[PDB]
Amino acid sequence: AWQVNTAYTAGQLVTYNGKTYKCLQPHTSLAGWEPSNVPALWQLQ
């Protein structure tokens, strides 16, 4: 369950509307990085 406005660490695993995502860079999720517009650190599948 991805969390908006949270702190994730590389190698993390978040999930959006029935979507699978894997954080690859230590950063903070904000109300905008939900669609995963930055594959540089968003490994979805």
The full set of domain ranges for the chain reads 1-45
Solving technique? NMR
Please give the backbone phi and psi of residue 41, each rounded to the nearest 5 degrees, phi first. -140, -5
The fold adopted by the segment(s) 1-45 is Seminal Fluid Protein  PDC-109 (Domain B) (2.10.10)
CB 20 within 8 A of CB 33: no
Q: DSSP assignment, residue 23? A: B
CB 20 within 8 A of CB 14: no
Give strand pairing partners of 6: 29
State which H helix or E strand residue 27 sits in.
strand 27-29
